[PDB]
Design a protein around this ligand. Structure first.
Ligand SMILES: [Ca+2]
Ligand SMILES: [Ca+2]
Ligand SMILES: [Ca+2]
Lengths: 64, 139
């Protein structure tokens, strides 16, 4: 069932977009290889999460 | 739907990706930033990402396309994705089932992330996150 991975990824990248608007979210703890997350880090993370959400959306629609 | 303060903020973010300063974002520069974050992107992943945003098809992202992406319905898509895991046709699945799908499939969220969505998404306070509550949280 091609839809299970696509659908999960859609949910997960959507929530990850949402969680990144909150600066205190535990979603910021997954960048284990950065010691001190600074302003320029967060801004590039915000952009990468948005792009990945748009990828996940196209792949979901491609699976249906 | 775009503040002028947002536009300059997005211009600054654009700069962090376009390090050569030629007004464009290539797959190499996206790869460079992601590896700088400790991520391990695949060259197809980088291609899917550029393709999703690159509206003119010249293989690269310049700032108007960046601006559009950051400014960009999603509701029904999220609803369809939730129904994929809807067994009994109820408006919900158990928190344990949700924790499984979120942690063991697709992106693989962390357990503290799933704790967070679970606490935040039970808007009505009855102990059960349903689909409609989840959607409203994101919208
Ligand atoms: Ca460039
Ligand atoms: Ca372009
Ligand atoms: Ca509830």
């Amino acid at each position: 069932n091609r839809q299970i991975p696509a659908a999960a990824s859609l949910i997960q990248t959507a929530w990850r977009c949402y969680a990144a608007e909150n600066p205190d979210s535990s979603t910021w703890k997954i960048y284990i290889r950065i010691s001190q997350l600074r302003e320029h880090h967060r801004a590039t993370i915000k952009v990468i999460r948005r792009m990945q959400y748009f990828v996940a959306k196209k792949k979901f629609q491609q699976a249906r | 739907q775009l503040t002028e303060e947002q536009i300059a903020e997005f211009k600054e973010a654009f700069s962090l990706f376009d390090k050569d300063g030629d007004g464009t974002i290539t797959t190499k520069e996206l790869g460079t930033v992601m590896r700088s974050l400790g991520q391990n992107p695949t060259e197809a992943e980088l291609q899917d990402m550029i393709n999703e945003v690159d509206a003119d098809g010249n293989g690269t992202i310049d700032f108007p396309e960046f601006l559009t992406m950051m400014a960009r319905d999603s509701e029904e898509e999220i609803r369809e994705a939730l129904r994929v895991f809807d067994k009994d046709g109820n408006g919900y699945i158990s928190a344990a089932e949700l924790r499984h799908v979120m942690t063991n499939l697709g992106e693989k969220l962390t357990d503290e992330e799933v704790d967070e969505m679970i606490r935040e998404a039970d808007i009505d306070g009855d102990g059960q996150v349903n689909y409609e509550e989840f959607v409203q949280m994101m919208t």
